Tab-separated table of N, CA and C and ligand atoms in Angstrom:
chain	number	residue	atom	x	y	z
A	1	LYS	N	0.862	-1.179	0.070
A	1	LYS	CA	0.158	0.044	0.017
A	1	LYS	C	0.804	1.360	0.034
A	2	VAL	N	0.463	2.165	-0.740
A	2	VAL	CA	1.197	3.649	-0.689
A	2	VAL	C	0.217	4.567	-0.021
A	3	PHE	N	0.468	5.002	1.173
A	3	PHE	CA	-0.289	5.912	2.013
A	3	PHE	C	-0.421	7.280	1.525
A	4	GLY	N	-1.375	7.951	1.781
A	4	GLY	CA	-1.489	9.433	1.589
A	4	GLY	C	-0.783	9.934	2.755
A	5	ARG	N	-0.267	11.181	2.457
A	5	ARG	CA	0.401	11.938	3.651
A	5	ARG	C	-0.359	12.092	5.001
A	6	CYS	N	-1.576	12.828	4.687
A	6	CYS	CA	-2.348	12.924	5.945
A	6	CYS	C	-3.037	11.726	6.408
A	7	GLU	N	-3.403	10.719	5.480
A	7	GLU	CA	-3.758	9.376	5.820
A	7	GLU	C	-2.769	8.819	6.950
A	8	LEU	N	-1.620	8.696	6.494
A	8	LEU	CA	-0.483	8.103	7.325
A	8	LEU	C	-0.332	9.062	8.753
A	9	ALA	N	-0.337	10.237	8.575
A	9	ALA	CA	-0.337	11.141	9.863
A	9	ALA	C	-1.355	10.851	10.888
A	10	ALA	N	-2.546	10.459	10.368
A	10	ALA	CA	-3.594	10.116	11.229
A	10	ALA	C	-3.340	8.818	11.999
A	11	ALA	N	-2.933	7.981	11.120
A	11	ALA	CA	-2.792	6.449	11.729
A	11	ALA	C	-1.402	6.493	12.732
A	12	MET	N	-0.490	7.300	12.418
A	12	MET	CA	0.567	7.268	13.212
A	12	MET	C	0.227	8.048	14.666
A	13	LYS	N	-0.631	9.145	14.642
A	13	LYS	CA	-1.192	9.804	15.851
A	13	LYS	C	-2.008	9.038	16.554
A	14	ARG	N	-2.731	8.117	15.948
A	14	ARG	CA	-3.687	7.050	16.597
A	14	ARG	C	-2.877	6.229	17.517
A	15	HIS	N	-1.515	5.934	16.933
A	15	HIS	CA	-0.727	4.941	17.616
A	15	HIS	C	0.340	5.381	18.576
A	16	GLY	N	0.012	6.662	18.782
A	16	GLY	CA	0.850	7.502	19.852
A	16	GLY	C	2.193	7.968	19.686
A	17	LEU	N	2.695	8.315	18.307
A	17	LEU	CA	3.737	8.856	17.825
A	17	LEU	C	3.958	10.240	18.046
A	18	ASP	N	2.871	11.104	18.170
A	18	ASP	CA	3.009	12.612	18.299
A	18	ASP	C	3.912	12.847	19.529
A	19	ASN	N	4.909	13.389	19.379
A	19	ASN	CA	5.979	13.855	20.671
A	19	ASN	C	6.647	12.679	21.319
A	20	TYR	N	6.237	11.355	20.747
A	20	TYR	CA	6.898	10.352	21.494
A	20	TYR	C	8.723	10.426	21.366
A	21	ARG	N	9.134	10.238	22.664
A	21	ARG	CA	10.417	10.386	22.954
A	21	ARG	C	11.064	11.643	22.483
A	22	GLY	N	10.123	12.814	22.404
A	22	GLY	CA	10.744	13.985	22.093
A	22	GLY	C	10.542	14.282	20.589
A	23	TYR	N	9.860	13.463	19.760
A	23	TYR	CA	9.721	13.718	18.380
A	23	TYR	C	8.358	13.903	17.946
A	24	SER	N	8.099	15.365	17.573
A	24	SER	CA	6.699	15.597	17.145
A	24	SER	C	6.242	14.883	15.909
A	25	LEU	N	5.052	14.752	15.607
A	25	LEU	CA	4.315	13.752	14.601
A	25	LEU	C	5.085	13.980	13.201
A	26	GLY	N	5.370	15.286	12.884
A	26	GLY	CA	5.812	15.543	11.579
A	26	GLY	C	7.154	14.883	11.372
A	27	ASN	N	8.025	14.666	12.254
A	27	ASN	CA	9.192	14.002	12.263
A	27	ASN	C	8.988	12.529	11.650
A	28	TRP	N	7.974	11.891	12.180
A	28	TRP	CA	7.713	10.472	11.759
A	28	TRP	C	7.073	10.294	10.152
A	29	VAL	N	6.339	11.415	9.994
A	29	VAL	CA	5.647	11.565	8.707
A	29	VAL	C	6.814	11.770	7.607
A	30	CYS	N	7.783	12.722	8.002
A	30	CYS	CA	8.876	12.935	6.935
A	30	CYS	C	9.739	11.712	6.931
A	31	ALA	N	9.955	10.893	8.060
A	31	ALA	CA	10.800	9.793	7.978
A	31	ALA	C	10.294	8.875	7.113
A	32	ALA	N	8.882	8.385	7.146
A	32	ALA	CA	8.237	7.673	6.304
A	32	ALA	C	8.312	8.038	4.878
A	33	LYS	N	8.200	9.384	4.463
A	33	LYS	CA	8.120	9.898	3.145
A	33	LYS	C	9.531	9.601	2.555
A	34	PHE	N	10.562	9.769	3.344
A	34	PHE	CA	11.998	9.696	2.566
A	34	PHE	C	12.606	8.373	2.810
A	35	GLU	N	12.175	7.405	3.712
A	35	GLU	CA	12.519	6.091	4.029
A	35	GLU	C	11.914	5.382	2.729
A	36	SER	N	10.617	5.474	2.643
A	36	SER	CA	9.917	4.347	1.899
A	36	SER	C	9.069	5.004	0.803
A	37	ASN	N	8.899	6.324	0.573
A	37	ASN	CA	7.862	6.898	-0.260
A	37	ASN	C	6.380	6.617	0.336
A	38	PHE	N	6.350	6.200	1.574
A	38	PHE	CA	5.036	6.077	2.075
A	38	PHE	C	4.573	4.602	1.609
A	39	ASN	N	5.478	3.822	1.174
A	39	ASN	CA	5.195	2.510	0.576
A	39	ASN	C	5.375	1.347	1.746
A	40	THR	N	4.408	0.648	2.009
A	40	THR	CA	4.380	-0.243	3.190
A	40	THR	C	5.338	-1.496	2.775
A	41	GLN	N	5.399	-1.702	1.467
A	41	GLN	CA	6.330	-2.889	1.185
A	41	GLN	C	7.602	-2.563	0.555
A	42	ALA	N	8.101	-1.304	0.817
A	42	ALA	CA	9.532	-1.026	0.364
A	42	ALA	C	10.519	-1.851	1.225
A	43	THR	N	11.633	-2.177	0.489
A	43	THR	CA	12.804	-2.986	1.223
A	43	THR	C	13.987	-2.576	0.707
A	44	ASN	N	15.162	-2.680	1.406
A	44	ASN	CA	16.459	-2.158	1.157
A	44	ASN	C	17.484	-3.117	1.471
A	45	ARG	N	18.116	-3.824	0.627
A	45	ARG	CA	19.209	-4.872	1.128
A	45	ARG	C	20.508	-4.106	1.320
A	46	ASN	N	21.197	-4.436	2.217
A	46	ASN	CA	22.313	-3.694	2.775
A	46	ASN	C	23.513	-4.732	2.750
A	47	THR	N	24.687	-4.250	2.861
A	47	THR	CA	25.970	-4.962	2.659
A	47	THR	C	26.337	-5.794	3.657
A	48	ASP	N	25.859	-5.734	4.930
A	48	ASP	CA	26.243	-6.421	5.976
A	48	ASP	C	25.261	-7.487	6.212
A	49	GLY	N	24.581	-7.883	5.177
A	49	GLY	CA	23.605	-8.970	5.236
A	49	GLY	C	22.217	-8.860	5.837
A	50	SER	N	21.996	-7.491	6.214
A	50	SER	CA	20.568	-7.361	6.734
A	50	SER	C	19.833	-6.568	5.606
A	51	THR	N	18.506	-6.454	5.797
A	51	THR	CA	17.637	-5.782	4.988
A	51	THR	C	16.794	-4.941	5.766
A	52	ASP	N	16.341	-3.670	5.241
A	52	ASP	CA	15.407	-2.712	5.773
A	52	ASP	C	13.973	-2.992	5.407
A	53	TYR	N	12.959	-3.025	6.303
A	53	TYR	CA	11.688	-3.455	5.818
A	53	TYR	C	10.577	-2.449	6.168
A	54	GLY	N	9.781	-2.195	5.185
A	54	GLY	CA	8.381	-1.414	5.197
A	54	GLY	C	8.487	-0.034	5.163
A	55	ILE	N	7.410	0.648	5.638
A	55	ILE	CA	7.078	2.087	5.513
A	55	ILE	C	8.075	2.869	6.496
A	56	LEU	N	8.635	2.416	7.457
A	56	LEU	CA	9.698	3.013	8.113
A	56	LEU	C	11.184	2.372	8.064
A	57	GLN	N	11.207	1.371	7.176
A	57	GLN	CA	12.616	0.861	6.750
A	57	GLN	C	13.448	0.342	7.891
A	58	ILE	N	12.739	-0.387	8.858
A	58	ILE	CA	13.243	-1.105	10.172
A	58	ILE	C	14.288	-2.332	9.685
A	59	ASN	N	15.501	-2.277	10.354
A	59	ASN	CA	16.432	-3.097	9.930
A	59	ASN	C	16.545	-4.510	10.744
A	60	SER	N	16.912	-5.453	9.963
A	60	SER	CA	16.719	-6.750	10.360
A	60	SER	C	17.865	-7.275	11.063
A	61	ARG	N	19.087	-6.692	11.481
A	61	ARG	CA	20.135	-7.067	12.235
A	61	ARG	C	19.509	-7.005	13.733
A	62	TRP	N	19.121	-5.807	14.292
A	62	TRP	CA	18.774	-5.704	15.691
A	62	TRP	C	17.184	-5.975	15.914
A	63	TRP	N	16.329	-5.752	14.881
A	63	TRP	CA	14.845	-5.409	15.422
A	63	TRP	C	14.008	-6.433	14.856
A	64	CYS	N	13.999	-7.247	13.762
A	64	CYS	CA	13.059	-8.170	13.304
A	64	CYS	C	13.840	-9.554	12.825
A	65	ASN	N	13.258	-10.738	12.788
A	65	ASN	CA	13.791	-11.897	12.276
A	65	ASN	C	13.108	-12.275	10.706
A	66	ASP	N	14.350	-12.325	9.947
A	66	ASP	CA	13.947	-12.717	8.525
A	66	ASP	C	14.730	-14.010	8.247
A	67	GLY	N	15.579	-14.585	9.266
A	67	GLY	CA	16.239	-15.710	9.087
A	67	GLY	C	17.358	-15.725	8.314
A	68	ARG	N	17.951	-14.602	7.955
A	68	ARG	CA	19.105	-14.628	6.995
A	68	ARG	C	20.107	-13.533	7.286
A	69	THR	N	19.988	-12.722	8.516
A	69	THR	CA	20.893	-11.815	8.956
A	69	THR	C	21.718	-12.083	10.026
A	70	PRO	N	22.964	-11.908	9.896
A	70	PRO	CA	24.116	-12.097	10.942
A	70	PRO	C	23.929	-10.891	12.062
A	71	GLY	N	24.313	-11.461	13.309
A	71	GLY	CA	24.288	-10.596	14.501
A	71	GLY	C	22.813	-10.120	14.902
A	72	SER	N	21.879	-11.438	14.562
A	72	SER	CA	20.396	-11.240	14.849
A	72	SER	C	20.254	-11.048	16.419
A	73	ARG	N	19.418	-10.114	16.645
A	73	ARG	CA	19.136	-9.801	18.024
A	73	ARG	C	17.415	-9.893	18.152
A	74	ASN	N	16.647	-9.553	16.889
A	74	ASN	CA	15.240	-9.706	16.914
A	74	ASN	C	14.459	-9.019	18.111
A	75	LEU	N	14.936	-7.798	18.519
A	75	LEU	CA	14.537	-7.026	19.652
A	75	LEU	C	13.052	-6.665	19.640
A	76	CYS	N	12.386	-6.495	18.516
A	76	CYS	CA	10.839	-6.455	18.536
A	76	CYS	C	10.154	-7.790	18.564
A	77	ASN	N	10.937	-8.718	18.585
A	77	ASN	CA	10.206	-10.094	18.627
A	77	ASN	C	9.448	-10.458	17.562
A	78	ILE	N	9.475	-10.147	16.330
A	78	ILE	CA	8.471	-10.305	15.302
A	78	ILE	C	9.197	-10.870	13.935
A	79	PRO	N	8.516	-11.534	13.197
A	79	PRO	CA	9.099	-11.793	11.934
A	79	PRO	C	9.112	-10.366	10.916
A	80	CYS	N	10.280	-10.307	10.133
A	80	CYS	CA	10.095	-9.184	9.291
A	80	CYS	C	8.951	-8.981	8.400
A	81	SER	N	8.343	-10.001	8.070
A	81	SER	CA	7.233	-10.055	7.258
A	81	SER	C	6.307	-9.181	7.869
A	82	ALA	N	6.058	-9.090	9.129
A	82	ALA	CA	4.981	-8.235	9.852
A	82	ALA	C	5.041	-6.847	9.631
A	83	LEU	N	6.338	-6.387	9.333
A	83	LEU	CA	6.774	-4.891	8.950
A	83	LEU	C	6.609	-4.617	7.501
A	84	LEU	N	5.895	-5.482	6.778
A	84	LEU	CA	5.486	-5.322	5.364
A	84	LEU	C	3.956	-5.225	5.283
A	85	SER	N	3.377	-5.326	6.286
A	85	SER	CA	1.836	-5.151	6.325
A	85	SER	C	1.296	-3.930	5.718
A	86	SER	N	-0.124	-3.953	5.138
A	86	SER	CA	-0.682	-2.735	4.768
A	86	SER	C	-1.196	-1.851	5.773
A	87	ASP	N	-1.435	-2.274	7.167
A	87	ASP	CA	-1.741	-1.437	8.179
A	87	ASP	C	-0.261	-1.320	8.857
A	88	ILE	N	-0.185	-0.093	9.543
A	88	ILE	CA	1.058	0.289	10.090
A	88	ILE	C	1.348	-0.139	11.636
A	89	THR	N	0.375	-0.883	12.114
A	89	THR	CA	0.455	-1.163	13.544
A	89	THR	C	1.920	-1.738	13.948
A	90	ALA	N	2.419	-2.901	13.306
A	90	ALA	CA	3.711	-3.466	13.683
A	90	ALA	C	4.815	-2.709	13.646
A	91	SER	N	4.841	-1.804	12.479
A	91	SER	CA	5.927	-1.011	12.279
A	91	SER	C	6.012	0.020	13.313
A	92	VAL	N	4.895	0.635	13.778
A	92	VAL	CA	4.780	1.780	14.570
A	92	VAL	C	5.293	1.108	16.058
A	93	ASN	N	4.633	0.143	16.383
A	93	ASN	CA	5.109	-0.500	17.661
A	93	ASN	C	6.563	-0.822	17.848
A	94	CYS	N	7.141	-1.294	16.825
A	94	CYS	CA	8.603	-1.495	16.880
A	94	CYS	C	9.167	-0.272	16.758
A	95	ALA	N	8.913	0.756	15.996
A	95	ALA	CA	9.697	2.055	16.136
A	95	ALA	C	9.673	2.589	17.458
A	96	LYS	N	8.712	2.562	18.278
A	96	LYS	CA	8.772	2.854	19.595
A	96	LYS	C	9.930	2.600	20.364
A	97	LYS	N	10.279	1.142	20.091
A	97	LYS	CA	11.287	0.462	20.722
A	97	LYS	C	12.622	0.952	20.422
A	98	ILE	N	12.836	1.118	18.963
A	98	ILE	CA	13.864	1.515	18.350
A	98	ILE	C	14.331	3.002	18.724
A	99	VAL	N	13.330	3.889	18.703
A	99	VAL	CA	13.538	5.347	19.130
A	99	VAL	C	14.023	5.317	20.623
A	100	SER	N	13.700	4.364	21.367
A	100	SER	CA	14.002	4.462	22.903
A	100	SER	C	15.444	4.362	23.158
A	101	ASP	N	16.221	3.867	22.199
A	101	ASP	CA	17.727	3.669	22.272
A	101	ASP	C	18.570	5.002	22.359
A	102	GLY	N	19.669	4.925	22.882
A	102	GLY	CA	20.267	6.288	22.818
A	102	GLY	C	20.200	6.952	21.448
A	103	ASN	N	20.223	6.370	20.395
A	103	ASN	CA	20.263	6.957	19.223
A	103	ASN	C	19.151	7.773	18.833
A	104	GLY	N	17.926	7.687	19.491
A	104	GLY	CA	16.769	8.597	18.921
A	104	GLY	C	16.649	8.244	17.458
A	105	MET	N	16.028	9.088	16.889
A	105	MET	CA	15.670	8.874	15.415
A	105	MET	C	16.842	8.992	14.385
A	106	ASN	N	17.918	9.108	14.955
A	106	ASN	CA	19.315	8.855	14.227
A	106	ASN	C	19.256	7.476	13.743
A	107	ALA	N	18.612	6.455	14.128
A	107	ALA	CA	18.518	5.028	13.732
A	107	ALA	C	17.880	5.014	12.345
A	108	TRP	N	17.210	6.089	11.718
A	108	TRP	CA	16.656	6.181	10.297
A	108	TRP	C	17.538	7.133	9.572
A	109	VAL	N	18.358	6.495	8.636
A	109	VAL	CA	19.176	7.188	7.670
A	109	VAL	C	18.424	8.161	7.040
A	110	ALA	N	17.106	7.948	6.477
A	110	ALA	CA	16.566	9.101	5.699
A	110	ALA	C	16.098	10.180	6.644
A	111	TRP	N	15.626	9.922	7.856
A	111	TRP	CA	15.342	11.066	8.823
A	111	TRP	C	16.731	11.821	8.954
A	112	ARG	N	17.911	11.084	9.207
A	112	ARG	CA	19.165	11.946	9.485
A	112	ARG	C	19.446	12.937	8.243
A	113	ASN	N	18.991	12.427	6.996
A	113	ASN	CA	19.535	13.040	5.818
A	113	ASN	C	18.628	14.105	5.252
A	114	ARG	N	17.201	13.999	5.555
A	114	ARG	CA	16.296	14.981	4.906
A	114	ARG	C	15.372	15.458	5.942
A	115	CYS	N	15.324	15.114	7.155
A	115	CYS	CA	14.323	15.410	8.286
A	115	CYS	C	14.919	16.187	9.434
A	116	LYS	N	16.001	15.751	9.848
A	116	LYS	CA	16.518	16.377	11.223
A	116	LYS	C	16.858	17.765	10.954
A	117	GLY	N	16.304	18.549	11.991
A	117	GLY	CA	16.319	19.981	12.072
A	117	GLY	C	15.565	20.763	11.063
A	118	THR	N	14.789	20.267	10.143
A	118	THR	CA	13.968	20.925	9.155
A	118	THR	C	12.662	21.210	9.646
A	119	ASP	N	11.744	22.078	8.920
A	119	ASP	CA	10.355	22.468	9.336
A	119	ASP	C	9.481	21.299	9.256
A	120	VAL	N	9.775	20.262	10.254
A	120	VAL	CA	8.867	19.091	10.135
A	120	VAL	C	7.356	19.314	10.354
A	121	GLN	N	7.077	20.232	10.881
A	121	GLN	CA	5.551	20.619	10.818
A	121	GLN	C	4.882	20.796	9.402
A	122	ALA	N	5.570	21.143	8.420
A	122	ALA	CA	5.167	21.054	7.198
A	122	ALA	C	4.405	19.859	6.642
A	123	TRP	N	4.959	18.746	7.208
A	123	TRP	CA	4.469	17.412	6.804
A	123	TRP	C	3.203	17.131	7.365
A	124	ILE	N	2.673	17.979	8.341
A	124	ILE	CA	1.277	17.705	8.665
A	124	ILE	C	0.387	18.685	8.332
A	125	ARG	N	0.874	19.563	7.399
A	125	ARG	CA	-0.018	20.645	6.973
A	125	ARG	C	-1.251	20.295	6.428
A	126	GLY	N	-2.415	21.015	6.694
A	126	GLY	CA	-3.573	20.722	6.107
A	126	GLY	C	-4.268	19.261	6.535
A	127	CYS	N	-3.656	18.625	7.713
A	127	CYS	CA	-4.059	17.482	7.949
A	127	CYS	C	-5.244	17.757	9.149
A	128	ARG	N	-4.980	18.716	10.121
A	128	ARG	CA	-5.927	19.070	10.981
A	128	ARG	C	-5.606	18.153	12.147
A	129	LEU	N	-4.272	18.198	12.468
A	129	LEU	CA	-3.662	17.301	13.673
A	129	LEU	C	-2.639	18.359	14.554
B	201	LIG	CL1	-3.972	12.027	2.440
B	202	LIG	CL1	-4.203	2.174	12.017
B	203	LIG	CL1	5.229	18.092	13.859
B	204	LIG	CL1	10.213	-12.610	7.899
B	205	LIG	CL1	19.076	0.034	13.706
B	206	LIG	NA1	16.662	1.404	8.534
């Protein structure tokens, strides 16, 4: 599924991301735009044997199990397949854990490169949130 911008904002707000661990809602919407282009089935294969999965491009070394990644910790205790679902529930839940690490949203390459320190409230413009 490819989410609309305000469509995704509403679901991310429903699931508690606005201001979570110090990150207002627009940070998460921006991260999804630039990680996955709002595509729930996006994937990115990496050089270390891991893969990034879903709308928030969550990495298979530490966070989900795909059965083929070294250094596996599966700290969200889920199959990586769950992160490719058309509803965002599993991805948002696992992102809460990821962001709770000392890294914060620096865990997201695309947030680091296109969202950090920008006008992230623009991402929820006209959404009524
Ligand atoms: Cl929309
Ligand atoms: Cl939802
Ligand atoms: Cl915001
Ligand atoms: Cl899987
Ligand atoms: Cl990570
Ligand atoms: Na990632």
